[PDB]
Design a binder for this molecule. Structure first.
Ligand SMILES: CCSC1=NC(=O)CC(=O)N1C1CCCCC1
Ligand SMILES: CCSC1=NC(=O)CC(=O)N1C1CCCCC1
Length: 134
């Protein structure tokens, strides 16, 4: 058993704010922003030993990352950036940093009440996305 337990399960998007703006900041093109912004993903978090898996399933894309906390990995994002990612647990929050082309973005995932809150930041543009158990 582990503190990451609080994240495990199947989650459904219930609200999004400022995500088109965040995606613009990151450099996502118009057509991708439109189609990804329409997506209503289900997000499946699981843990097997030290390996955490986060899967997103939507009509836009079905993606998945697996990782060990603190240990860099290379990720291809749904908008086709090739980034170096590191995810750590800080004070109960999963902190995901992606670095590419001298740029960086941080994605925080946290449990608040019965929700899983996703906060995405690029420069000083923040987007908040709220998920509930499916
Ligand atoms: C735009 C949909 S993708 C997505 N959306 C979210 O709001 C949270 C989340 O973590 N993901 C992905 C990221 C890549 C790994 C699998 C999950
Ligand atoms: C909520 C995290 S956003 C995110 N995280 C990733 O780890 C991969 C990825 O592809 N994305 C975005 C990128 C913009 C297009 C929509 C998905």
């Amino acid at each position: 058993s582990h503190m990451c337990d609080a994240f495990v399960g199947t989650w459904k998007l219930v609200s999004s704010e400022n995500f088109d703006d965040y995606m613009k900041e990151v450099g996502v093109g118009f057509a991708t922003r439109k189609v990804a912004g329409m997506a209503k993903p289900n997000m499946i978090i699981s843990v097997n030993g030290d390996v955490i898996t986060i899967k997103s399933e939507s009509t836009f894309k079905n993606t998945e990352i697996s990782f060990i906390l603190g240990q860099e990995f290379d990720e291809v994002t749904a908008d086709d950036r090739k980034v170096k990612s590191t995810i750590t647990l800080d004070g109960g929050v999963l902190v995901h940093v992606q670095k590419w082309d001298g740029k960086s973005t941080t994605i925080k995932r946290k449990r608040e009440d019965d929700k899983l809150v996703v906060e995405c930041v690029m420069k000083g543009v923040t987007s908040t996305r709220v998920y509930e158990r499916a």
